[PDB]
């Protein structure tokens, strides 16, 4: 026991001294080797080392014009923006490299070994992405009227296109979710996403805006296309007043950088092509910034307003939230909600959160009446004045 205790202190020095031997064998620092997958890969790996496949320099192929001296040549423009005419390394056919497609070329010997995967140039957009999140279903208010309306458009073609063709109905496209902050445009979208069980990419537009004008635009088209190719994709575009703002200039400023990207999104949704069956959802912070192209049916078939959750909604959010929580059940959860003024969805929940905290604070296996009264009287006075909604709603 006493012997065992001594080792706790010791192990830290012991790992530090040993550290050059650990580094070589397991990984990180001096001589990075994992030993488990690069070992297995080693025989294949030898082929690449021998060749000039290292380097294999980032590029995209402009045109595959072949010409004389060395016959299989391709005209490539690198991502840093200068063109090279290159050769084919025998390991693929001239068929594999195709005009407009992303391709790898060497820097020491300019020639294609293996073509580089096309359109995955944004890393910034990927940063935000978590596939299938949600706080928990209980905070939503569960099934609201708001959730059910959203499923008819959203869930149903992804889950079954079969039923769509059978009846003979065109498949939907766009749902525009709007309301001031905290009416839960994102919360409901996450809930339907999980249910349908389509792969889920949500992204903030604020990372599809980067560097100067036109670089952000390249990111939006390539991302969108990639999703479109993919069968049963759901894209929830989170908070766009960052690729979704007003269209003007006054020639003392200009909205341009924002409008280049916004317009690039709008164009792509249905396309100049019929439509796909892959769904787009847009969440906007203003209904006051939208231009008519976005609004046309077949890029936006029905407008759903998630603004200030409905008369039914205010009570469901408290009771379904209350259900989950250890709380008193001699108080009417609806009475607390009803008290709440012109409540944004975020605000109804704010009562539950504040109410529960007092209950946790005591460390009881329920809650008491007192915790609820202080919470609710506080919420009605202060919070409501200080919500998003008074300022935004008049504007909108």
């Amino acid at each position: 026991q006493s012997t065992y205790s001594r080792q706790i202190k010791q192990v830290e020095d012991d790992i530090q001294q040993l550290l050059k031997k650990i580094n070589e064998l397991t990984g990180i620092k001096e001589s990075d080797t994992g030993l488990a997958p690069p070992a297995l890969w080693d025989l294949a790996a030898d082929k690449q080392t021998l060749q000039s496949e290292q380097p294999l320099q980032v590029a995209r192929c402009t045109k595959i014009i072949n010409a004389d001296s060395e016959d299989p040549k391709y005209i490539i423009n690198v991502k840093q923006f200068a063109k090279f005419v290159v050769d084919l390394s025998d390991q693929v056919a001239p068929t594999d490299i195709e005009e407009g497609m992303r391709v790898g070329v060497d820097r020491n010997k300019y020639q294609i070994h293996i073509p580089l995967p096309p359109k995955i140039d944004p890393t910034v957009t990927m940063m935000q992405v978590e596939e299938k999140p949600d706080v928990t279903y209980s905070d939503v208010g569960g099934c609201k009227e708001q959730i059910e309306k959203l499923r008819e458009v959203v869930e149903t073609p992804l889950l079954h296109p079969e039923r769509f063709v059978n009846l003979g109905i065109e498949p939907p496209k766009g749902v525009l979710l709007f309301g001031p902050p905290g009416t839960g445009k994102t919360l409901c979208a996450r809930a339907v996403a999980n249910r349908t069980d389509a792969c889920f990419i949500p992204v903030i537009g604020s990372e599809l805006v980067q560097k100067y004008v036109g670089e952000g635009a390249r990111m939006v088209r390539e991302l969108f296309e990639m999703a479109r190719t993919k069968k049963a994709c759901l894209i929830f575009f989170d908070e766009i007043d960052a690729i979704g703002g007003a269209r003007f200039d006054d020639g003392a400023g200009g909205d341009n950088e924002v409008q280049r990207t916004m317009l690039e999104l709008i164009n792509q949704l249905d396309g100049f092509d019929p439509r796909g069956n892959i769904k787009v959802l847009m969440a906007t912070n203003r209904p006051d910034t939208l231009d008519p192209a976005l609004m046309r049916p077949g890029r936006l078939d029905r407008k759903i307003e998630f603004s200030l959750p409905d008369l039914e909604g205010r009570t469901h959010i408290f009771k379904i939230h209350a259900r989950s929580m250890s709380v008193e059940r001699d108080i009417r959860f609806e009475l607390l909600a009803r008290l709440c003024p012109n409540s944004t969805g975020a605000e109804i929940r704010s009562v539950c959160t504040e109410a529960g905290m007092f209950a946790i604070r005591a460390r009881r296996k329920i809650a008491t009446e007192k915790d609820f009264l202080e919470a609710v009287n506080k919420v009605i006075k202060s919070y409501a004045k200080f919500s998003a909604t008074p300022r935004y709603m008049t504007y909108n």
Binding site: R60, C61, T62, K63, I65, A67, D68, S69, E70, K73, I75, N77, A82, K83, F84, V85, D87, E99, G100, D106, R107, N108, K109, Y110, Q111, F272, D273, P274
Partner: protein, 147 residues
């Protein structure tokens, strides 16, 4: 014999090779430019068909152009290859668009058929007349005499 003389050039001729563009096309004699006087009254300018080349690394290289595809074909805007290991013209390539432009080219859209796209009858006539007819039904337009 051609391969043998070419042999010193041939090592540089292979990979890597850059691409470049033609600042000027210089059409002169096939081999040996004029001779200058002074001490030794003989050549210093031996330039055959030649091109003054600006590379796209923002460097400028002078080189006598290959007798297989001469300077004369070459003009400003044309792509031409040039070898990195020693700046000779690897090849001649024709002028071509960016990758973005390749996306821009045809994709084609399918028919909604005139009858089948509901109403707006007066408008079917306006678009058909303006757009598709001058291209396809071109002879009637030539007969009208309009541009």
């Amino acid at each position: 014999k051609i391969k043998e003389n070419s042999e010193k050039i041939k090592v540089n001729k292979t990979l890597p090779y850059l691409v470049s563009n033609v600042i000027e096309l210089l059409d002169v004699d096939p081999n040996d430019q004029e001779e200058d006087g002074a001490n030794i009254d003989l050549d210093s300018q031996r330039k055959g068909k030649c091109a003054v080349i600006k590379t796209s690394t923002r460097q400028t290289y002078f080189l006598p152009v290959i007798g297989l595809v001469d300077a004369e074909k070459l003009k400003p805007g044309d792509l031409v290859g040039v070898n990195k290991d020693s700046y000779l013209i690897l090849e001649t390539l024709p002028t071509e668009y960016d990758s973005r432009v390749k996306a821009m080219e045809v994709d084609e859209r399918p028919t909604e058929q005139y009858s089948d796209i509901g109403g707006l009858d007066k408008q079917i006539q306006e678009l058909v007349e303006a757009i598709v007819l001058p291209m396809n039904h071109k002879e009637k337009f030539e007969n009208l005499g309009i541009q």
